[PDB]
Symmetry: C2
Subunit: 191 residues, 2 copies
């Protein structure tokens, strides 16, 4: 039994990263570059209607992630409480995250699923929920997240990096992350 | 700015570890006994004592009595303490735990320790470990250490700056309590505290607990109704630095 056990991140691909957008462009673009340098293929969506958001994300949930390390999904800036805003409706986050629970999504079983909600609980093994809260240059949270990904994304254990974000932001609003991760999570460079 | 910044733990004292342990309840609450909870209590007491805490246990307090002890504790000086730990072993659901006779909202308990209301813990880690869920009537499929299994019911919420909220189980999963040996969560937490508490960063350690617990399986021929009801623990961190419990 090894206390240093890490998620195996040696799949052909790092995986998909979804950005749903609802100043806020700076956030989106900054997240895009950061996740790309981390290997992620990034898909962005703008002001989707609920029928269309559900359609898309379900599409994504049902393709094979067999050859991927993990999955990232970002909602900025939707979400009061346990909901997120589409164009025409609020949607329970659990309804979206649920598509990725081991039951409903076999190829991500054992792999980390990361959800980042920025404000205007869901659960599953190997989930990591990041909440921004419990400007033309962006928002405090995303700016700092991207600054940390930039300098440390490739080396620090991910939840340590999120703690950094907690600290940078709380020195200016207290963000938080909830972990159901079962191992250390690193994004060392691939191939 | 330092990626490896740690909470300063060089205070005179480690701090207080509170344990609120609840085995039985008032009849009108309609809750079952929590057999095995005293094993949890005792195991935690040894582990946290090893790590330097003055541990104060309380058994089956009524809500008012409990509110009073928690309040008394939040109003003494903590200036020469590294941190604070509180544990609830009781029933609960949504946003509340149960004392002996009544529900108490969690946000009321943590609230007592938020920077406004509690100055001497500002910037210090406040750690809540919650092993709670609502016992129901179990259908027993057949015809002494029994494994009891219930659905997660307590919302796994965050609490404020420098709080770390640790939950035995997350939504959609199941809590397990062995009538003799105690909770899967508390057992595994104490085993990890035992082997690594004085070496490993606390959140790393809690990750280990997530793994040991979520790997546990009931044995079918001993507890047929309980598998496979997976248990997934969860922690919410609003910590701002690395947390260690090195010997003082």
């Amino acid at each position: 039994f090894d206390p240093a056990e890490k998620y195996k991140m040696d799949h052909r691909r790092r995986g998909i990263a979804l950005i749903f957008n609802h100043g806020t462009c700076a956030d989106r673009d900054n997240l895009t570059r950061r996740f790309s340098d981390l290997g992620f293929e990034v898909k962005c969506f703008n002001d989707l209607k609920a029928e269309e958001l559900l359609l898309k994300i379900h599409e994504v949930s049902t393709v094979s992630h067999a050859d991927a390390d993990c999955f990232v999904c970002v909602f900025l800036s939707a979400g009061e409480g346990n909901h997120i805003y589409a164009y025409d409706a609020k949607i329970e986050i659990q309804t979206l995250t649920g598509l990725f629970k081991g039951d409903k999504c076999h190829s991500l079983v054992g792999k980390p699923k990361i959800f980042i909600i920025q404000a205007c609980l869901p659960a599953g093994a190997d989930f990591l929920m990041c909440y921004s809260v419990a400007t033309v240059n962006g928002s405090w949270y995303i700016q700092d997240l991207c600054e940390m990904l930039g300098k440390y994304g490739s080396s620090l254990e991910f939840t340590e990096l999120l703690t950094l974000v907690n600290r940078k932001v709380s020195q200016r609003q207290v963000p938080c992350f909830a972990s159901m991760l079962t191992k250390k999570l690193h994004f060392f460079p691939k191939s």
